[PDB]
Structures are given as structure tokens and as C-alpha cells.
Amino acid sequence: MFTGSIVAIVTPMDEKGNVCRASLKKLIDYHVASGTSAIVSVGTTGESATLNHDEHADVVMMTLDLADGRIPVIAGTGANATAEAISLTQRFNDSGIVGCLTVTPYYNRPSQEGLYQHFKAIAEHTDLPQILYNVPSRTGCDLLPETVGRLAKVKNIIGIKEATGNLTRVNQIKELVSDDFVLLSGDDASALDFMQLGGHGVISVTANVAARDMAQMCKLAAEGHFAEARVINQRLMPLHNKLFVEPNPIPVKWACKELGLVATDTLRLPMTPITDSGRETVRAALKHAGLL
Amino acid sequence: MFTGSIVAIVTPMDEKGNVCRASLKKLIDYHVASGTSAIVSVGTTGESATLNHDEHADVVMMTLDLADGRIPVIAGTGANATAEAISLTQRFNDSGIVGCLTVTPYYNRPSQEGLYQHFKAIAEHTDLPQILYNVPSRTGCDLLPETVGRLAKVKNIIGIKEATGNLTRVNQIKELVSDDFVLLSGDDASALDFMQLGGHGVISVTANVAARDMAQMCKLAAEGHFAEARVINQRLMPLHNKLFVEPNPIPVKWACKELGLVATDTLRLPMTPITDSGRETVRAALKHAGLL
Amino acid sequence: MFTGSIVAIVTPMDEKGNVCRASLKKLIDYHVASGTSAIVSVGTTGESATLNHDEHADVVMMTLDLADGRIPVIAGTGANATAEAISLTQRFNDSGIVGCLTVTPYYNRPSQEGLYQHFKAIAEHTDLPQILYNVPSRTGCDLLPETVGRLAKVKNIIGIKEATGNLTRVNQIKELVSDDFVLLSGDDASALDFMQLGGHGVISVTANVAARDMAQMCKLAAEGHFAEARVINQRLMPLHNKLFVEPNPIPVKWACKELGLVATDTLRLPMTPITDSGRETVRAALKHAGLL
Amino acid sequence: MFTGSIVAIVTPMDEKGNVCRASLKKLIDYHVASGTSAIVSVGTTGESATLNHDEHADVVMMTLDLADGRIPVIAGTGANATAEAISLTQRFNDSGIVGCLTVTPYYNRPSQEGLYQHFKAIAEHTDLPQILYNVPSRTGCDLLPETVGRLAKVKNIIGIKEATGNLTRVNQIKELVSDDFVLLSGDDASALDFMQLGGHGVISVTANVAARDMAQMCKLAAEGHFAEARVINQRLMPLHNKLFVEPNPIPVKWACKELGLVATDTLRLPMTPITDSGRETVRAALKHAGLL
Ligand SMILES: [Cl-]
Ligand SMILES: [Cl-]
Ligand SMILES: [Cl-]
Ligand SMILES: [Cl-]
Ligand SMILES: [K+]
Ligand SMILES: [K+]
Ligand SMILES: [K+]
Ligand SMILES: [K+]
């Protein structure tokens, strides 16, 4: 729902760069079988950047259909113009998605006041639960804990994807928000740490190819079995890192193809095909995880 | 014109956030009279982020119409999806613009190879001159001199707006490109330095309100009269800094409103109104520049 | 010993800038009464930088005497020349100190191999237990986990003071070292987090003025009572931050004087007296902690 | 001489790590013949870090003796304790050195006010010219232009070695100081740029092995012949970079040994011998410079 291992799912494409429905179906069955808690549809790893809003919606709706109620679906709804964020969100109103993942505006570098006004207006135009998303390395913008606390007072703003990799944020935010506000890691390599500090789960790239291990790792973590969870983490750590050897989702799409989870590893420009060195790097990491 | 003082022009809005033609006319007249070399239309300072492509196109066409041939117009054409950059570029084919200013894809953090393919594909599908645009603080990625060198070999790719503020970039780029490739500062505070090291001009925010001083400073710099230019630069430096006291273009729109150049300082969310503290800072900088 | 709240104790000085024995005695009695686990003598907060090695040794020996076996004493032994680090360490051989805190060489920015050779030679010239100390913001040098793992294989290298504030180091180092290798925070503001991740204690500036709260906080943490510990942490957090409002130990020495723990707040150049604004800032933080 | 090419000279050692007089003589003769403007003795590249003050003094006196009046000598006199900087400075009173190069206190991270008091006290207690030295990557602190301006009003404080590599500093400083205050690069890779913006010379590592080319480059720069200088700079750029492939002065000592300028490339710990990979990198850079 908004806890445990949530997959930031690739948008599998055919060689023309359009969504491949057979491959998407395969992935969703895989996550259902693997115990993945929920799917984020057309977020960062889903190539929101290169899909238009029509194409984006189509993929979300298709993911919802294919999930067929077996697994919750969260739509990516980020936009750097507030009007566009509202319009995108409105597409999914009364759709069946259980919530939205909405990133700080990118490029235009708003103030903390701008962020507040952005997310508040968005939340006001929907009944859907909103998960905030902070990823300064991609946006040029850093949603600080104090502002998270402001926004957590809005009824349908109910969690955050914290992708800074700065573990001090977990308790800075937690102390400012209510106990049911959800704290999700957006950084695979630090996600178990994030959970040990009081985080509730992760929105994961790694889970695309190691869904069963990730679900188990998060379950152990939630049970306070951190040492057991670390064993899994150590097995996956090469993948947490090397899935970013080239820009995400170049590595993870290749990985999915190699594992036979998708038909092709095709991306849209300006993402380009994985290099030979990248292939070998990712293959090694998959081997280390025992997936190959 | 791709040398000298080039204004990164505001998109003046009425209170509803729609383009104010009368204000835009006033600004264009001001720049024609003040010796500005060219206008960048719907660039960063022009709120490209919050105008849709159709609104974007309208503002460029209006700017051309109002310019009435008296000052060259460069269109902002950046997009983080290569297909979308190409598509936007096509709207301006035979429009009368003299070239395009195209930013590195934002948010998705492409590799240098991806940047190369991005910009190459765009240049391929137009006859218009292309000015590359590097601004890592906004985008999350950094177009490096090596790649600029590769791209400069494309007939159509004629220069760069270098907005890092990292002055070593000037001669790293210059040595990799031909003598006609144009090097333009995208950082007002370091732009005179940038010119002194070999740069050809500036795509300027400060020029929105200090057009004549900017024009003279850039001509003096082009003539090698750096001490003379620097005296002007010193009176402008508070403005170069404090126009970013709050996110651009909030301070510069307020300044234009205060001088009577535009009718309102309205922006679109996630930009919010200037704070009182911001007004005082900006006002003092206007006064140091001799503008109030 | 090497667990719980370890104070990075100020070197209290008279108005001439020499160690004040009465004030030192008062502090040591205070830490004995407060339940502080151990004292680091002439570390960072002890002004190792401005004491010569004779003066440094004198303070260590005086601290040892005054402690009179009631509380363990760790000597600061850092030097950026390996020969000097050995010579300093040798002063304390068979002294009564229970171990040494030895920082990465500062200024000369050694390789990971240089760090390895530095700490290994030092450890080879003593039977004293060695605590490594990483504080890149002061040294220009970052001792990475992998190198920590190398050095942990040396018999008398038994722990690390990790002052990066980067919480990911806790588990990166822990997985590479044996279960009795000690992990101590060197960053008050993140120290409870550091302990929640598996750290064993903190070498603390805050403990100079809030020794009882710090000892209790670390005890709760060690017992797994993290929520109770956080309550104390929140009470101290203003102090964790504001004790660095001006360069350490300017704030904490003023604080000690204000609390009547020391006779004067005198420092050696280039440390200078606390500013009026700094006073008011620290006073507020002490009030928030309920110490004033 | 405080303009032109100033060499940051190595302290050549025998295998025991003691100063090699015969090697030092050879280096000084080389610099006299090659047109170097002056020698910095026991600066950063001279292993000030690992020589004690008495060894430090000996090397300066030997350098003066060997120079025999044929080239000016500046002594490195930095210390992180103000009393110790003054004390070291006194050793060189009436020695024959032409001035001192004094770094911002390292490790203890003083305030700007502390820097001001530090440098003011030092200048006060000598008649020797003082050159301030800013290198935040080594020290943990940053002497800002405002404070440089304050200090430049001291009769005795005559210039700065600016080693940030941040080229905006040149004119920020220049506008705050008199026209006779000397601005010297401390970053070989950006030194020609630094000179082109108004700098007067460079305190150079590269000059240890490319003395004549460095001398000519700096004279051309001083005459405003930047294109001519830049051609030399381009052949030297691999060296400007790869002399820092491993910590300075490891690469430059190896290079001096390879050219036969010094008898051994021995250093003192925590500096360690060059790696094989480092040798190959440095050798290629020597060959690109035409030196092998
Ligand atoms: Cl996502
Ligand atoms: Cl622009
Ligand atoms: Cl300490
Ligand atoms: Cl030097
Ligand atoms: K809420
Ligand atoms: K071209
Ligand atoms: K050990
Ligand atoms: K002076």
C-alpha cells in the first residue's frame, strides 16, 4: 500500500519505444508472485521524462488493468508546473490507483514557500493520497523537513519518498509529522539503514529484478530483524550500486531483458543503449545476487 | 546576433498569469532603444517551465511580431525528451527567429553520449542555428567540454550558454572548437570574467533592467577594455547577485514592475510573490545600479 | 572505556591561555558525578591545534592525575607527520591512559595507502589501543570504510571516531570489521541516529555541558530505548547545533563558563572570543536544554 | 620577486628522508638558469608537513646559501597556532629571505575574524613581506575576499597565493586591494586563466620540472600575449593535472628523479612511493610536455 518493498517499475518498450503490454503483464505477474507490496507506475524509473501525459496515463491505466486488483498501484504525477501537476493528477481521479507520487518541481528551483503552495494546490484538487518525492540530484531543489512538516498537515498528504541518501532526514521528518505519515527510501543502497532508523519501506529500482529478495528484506526490517535483512542487503548491494552505472533505467532495463522479464531493453532518447562495459558490470552484480 | 548583451527576457503576465502584450511591447521597445544585441524568448527567465508548448510558441511569435525586425529573437526550445525538443523546434521553422537555445535534458540525467545524441538529432532536423545550454544547478547534469567539442562539429551547432559559473570552462571549450563557435555566459555575476577569458557575450537576467549598461559593458569587454567594463560591472554586481535572492524570475519581474517596464509582477506557480525582505534587497540593488 | 558518552573535554585556560588546574579538576569531578563513560584529553575540542606537544602531554598527565582512577582517559595523539604521531604516542606509553585517539593526517592529504601506513606504524610503536578518527571537513582527507577494514586487522586498532555526519558509514564499516570493533560518533547532531544504526557511543562536545543528559541518552540507546533517548536528543539538539555557531570550542567554552564549570572562557589564537550574537545563541540553546 | 613563475620547490631527500644538499643545489642551479622568478622554500610541495621547525629552518638556510644571491627565496612559515607562526617567522628575521608564505590555520577552522587576528599578529612581529595563502581543500577553511581586503591594509601584507581554483576570486580580491597587492595562482591547472583575469604570477608545482616554459608562459601572460602563453599552457596541461594523480609531492618528486634533477624520489610518511600506474601517467605527461 505505502509500506514494504514498492517497485519503481520500468515501462517496458518494444523496439519502436512504445509500451510493450506482454512484457508489462509479465512484470506485474512477477511482482504479484514475488510479494512486492505495490507498484509505482510511470515514476522516475518508468521514464516519466520521455512519455507525454497521454502516453503516461495509458501506461498507468494499463498497469492498473493488468494488476487486476492483485497489487496496489501508485501513479507518478510529478510536473514542474503546478497546473500541469493538477491536470495529470486529475486524470487518475476515480481510476483505481491508491495514491500519487509527486516530485518537487525540477529546473525552476522553487522556494520552500513555492513547494508548499505547489503540493497544497495539488492535494486540494484530488481525493487521492499524495506521496511527496525529494530527489535534489535530479531536480535542483531540496524539500526540507520543516516544509515536509507543514505539508503533512494537509489531510491527503500522507508520506514521502526521500531520495537524498542523507539518512539524517528520517528522524528530522519523523519528529515533525504524525506517526502514520509514511517514510519511504528513494535510495536502494541506503534503504535498509533508512528503515533501521524508522523508515517504513522503499520505492525501489533494485526490486525490478530482485523482487522476492527485496520483499523479504523489508519484511525482516519491519520485524526488527536487521541482521538477517543485512545478509540479503549485502547480496544485493552490488546491484543497488551498479543499476546506476549508467543513467537509470538503462541498467535495470538491460537486467530485466537478461532475466527474460521483458522482451526488449529499448529506451527513449536521451537514454541510450547500455554500453558493453555496463553490461558486464550489471551481469556481475546479478551473479553476485544469485539471479544469474 | 549571438555576441554582446543578449537579454533573457521575462514573460510579463497579467494577474491571471497570461502574457501581457502591452508590457512585452514596452520591454521590446526598451531593448531596441538600449542597444541589446538580441532577445531570448521563453528561456529560463521567461518561465519556459510553466508555459505549455502552445503558449510558449505564442509568446515567441508575439515577440517576433513586436520586434518587427528591429532586434533578433532566439527561441528557447529545450526539452528533456529528444522527440519533444525536435517537435518544439519544428514550430519555429521559418518563423523569423535567428536561432534556438536548447538546454541539456533535465531530471533524467543522461550520459555524455546521450547528450551528444540528443543535441545531434535536434540539429539534424532543422536549419536553425542551435545554442547549447549547460546549467547543472537546474538540470542535474553537466555537458562537459569534450562533448561540446564533439557537438561543435555539427554545422548547425554554433555556440553555448555556459551557466555553471565555472570559469575554467571557457578555455577548455575554446580549445576544442573553432574560432567562430560562440561562447556565452549564463551567469551574470561572473559574466565579465567569462568575457575577459575569451567569451563573446552573455545571456543575461540583469539586462532586463540595466540594458544600456549591460550593452556598453559587453562592447567594452569585446574591445578588450576590461577596466572600463569592470567599473560598470561593479555598479551592477549587487543586481547580478540579488536578482537571485529569491528564485528567478521572481526578483527581476518585481524590479521590472518597480521601474514601470511591466504592468504586473505576476508569475505562475510554483513561483510565488516576492517577500518584503526580497523587495528591500532588490530595491537597494536597483539603487546601487543607479536605476531608481 | 570505548562505549557510551565520551566527553571531548575542553582544556580550560586562565586569562594567559595556560591550563587552569582548578577548572580542569571541577570538570573531571563533574564527569565522574554525571556518569560520563570516559574523557578524551587534548583532542579537537581540547585545542590540540594550539598546544605544543609538551603542553599537550602536561594536560593529559594532569587530567589522568585528577581523574585518580575514577574515569578512563583517552589521549589525543594525532599528528600529520607519522614520526610526530609516534613520538607523541610514545609519551603516553605506560602512563595510565587507556587508549589513543589518532586523526587522519591533515593538510598533506595522504592516499588510502598513506593512511594505512601511517596508522599501522603508529600502532606498531605502542601497546595502547588506538581509536581512528575521520573528520574530512577539518583535514582534507577521508578515511574510507575499506581502509578502516584493513586497519582493523591490526591487533591494537580497535575503533573509530567517525565525524563525517554521513550515517551510511556505520554499516559500511561494521560489515568489514569484527564485532568488537568500536564505532563512535564524532557528530553530536547525528549521534543518536549513528547509535540506532549500530554505533556504540559518541565522542561528544555537547557532553561538556550536558554530561548527565548525554550519559542517559547513550544508556537508553544502548538498551534499545530509542524513543526515550530521542526525547533527550530533542531537548539537546539546539546545543548539538549551536555549539558550532562559532568555531569549536569557542561556544562550548563560553557555555562552561556560564554554567560555572570553568573560571574563564579564554582560548588561544586563532580562536577568538565569542561574539555577542554567539553568546545569545548559545544561551538560548542552554535554556532549551534546561541547563539555565 | 613576487610576480612571474615562482617554484614551489621540492625538498629532495636521500633514502633516509633527510635533505639531499647535492640535489637541492642541482635544482637551484636549474631554476637560476631557467628564469624562475623566485623559490618558495618548505612550502606545501616542500613537505612542510613532515619537517619539524628546525629541519624546516635548515632547509631554508641551505636554500639561501645555495642560491647565493642569484634568485630570491620566500620561506614557507605557516602554522595553525598563531604563537607558533610568529615563532617560526622569527627564525628567518634577517636571514636573507625576501618574504614569507603563510597559510590559513588548518584543522581548527577559524572564523574570518580569527584569520584576521592570526595574520595581523604575524605581520606585526616582523618586517618581512607576507604572502597570505588560501587552500581550503587542505585546511578546512576559506579566507574570503572581504578579509583579504582588511588584511591588505597591513603595510607588511603584500599578496596572496590563491589556491581554490575558483577564478571569480581574482577580481573580488583585486577590487578590494591596492594596485600593488600581488595576486598569485596556487593552482597550476587554472593559473594561466588566473593571470588572464589580472593575476601577477603563479606559485607553481609544474615549474619544478618545466621551469623555462613556465617562465616564458608567465612573461607572455604579463605582457598580455595570452594566445602565445596558452600554446605553452596546452603542452603543460597534462602535467598540471597529473602532478596531482597521487598526493603532492609524490608525482613531482618522481618526475624530478626521472629527469635526473634529484638523486632519489624519497618522501616522508604519510607520503608513500608512487604506484606503477602513477609512473606511467606522469611519464606520459612529461612526454607531452616535451621533457622526456
Ligand atoms: Cl519512482
Ligand atoms: Cl535563457
Ligand atoms: Cl576529540
Ligand atoms: Cl607553496
Ligand atoms: K496528512
Ligand atoms: K558548428
Ligand atoms: K583490531
Ligand atoms: K599592504
Give Rg of chain A in angstroms. Answer: 18 Å
Strand content of chain A is 5-15%
Distance between the termini of chain A: 30 Å
Number of strands of chain A: 8
The oligomeric status of these chains comes to homotetramer
**Tell me about the biggest sheet of chain A?**
8 strands, parallel, barrel
How many H/I helices of chain A?
12
Order of helical and strand elements of chain A: EHEHEHEHEHHEHEHEHHHH
Shape descriptor of chain A: globular
User: What is the CATH C-level name of chain A?
Assistant: Alpha Beta
CATH architecture of chain A: Alpha-Beta Barrel
Biggest interface goes to: A-B, 36 and 35 residues
Within the largest sheet of chain A, what's the order of strands? 1-2-3-4-5-6-7-8
What is the name of the CATH topology of chain A?
Answer: TIM Barrel
Task: Give every kind of bound small molecule, once each.
Answer: chloride ion, potassium ion
Structural class, judged by helices and strands of chain A? Answer: alpha/beta
Into how many domains do the coordinates of chain A divide?
1
PDB class: lyase
Keywords: dihydrodipicolinate synthase, lyase
Assembly: tetrameric
Entry title: Structure of E. coli dihydrodipicolinate synthase to 1.9 A
Describe the 3D structure.
- The PDB classes it as lyase.
- The structure is a homotetramer of 292-residue chains.
- The first copy, chain A, is α/β, with parallel strands linked by helices and 292 residues long.
- Chain A has a single domain, classed as Aldolase class I (TIM Barrel), CATH 3.20.20.70.
- Chain A has helices at residues 21-34, 53-67, 82-90, 112-124, 136-139, 145-151, 169-174, 191-196, 211-222, 226-242, 250-258, 276-288; strands at 4-8, 38-41, 73-76, 99-103, 130-134, 157-162, 182-185, 201-204.
- Chain A has an eight-stranded parallel barrel with strand order 1-2-3-4-5-6-7-8.
- In chain A, α8 links the parallel β7 (182-185) and β8.
- In chain A, α1 (21-34) packs across α2 and α10 runs antiparallel to α12.
- Chain A binds chain B through residues 44, 47, 49-52, 80-84, 105-111, 113-115, 117-118, 121, 137-140, 246-248, 268-272, and chain B through 44, 47, 49-50, 52, 80-84, 105-111, 113-115, 117-118, 121, 137-140, 246-248, 268-272.
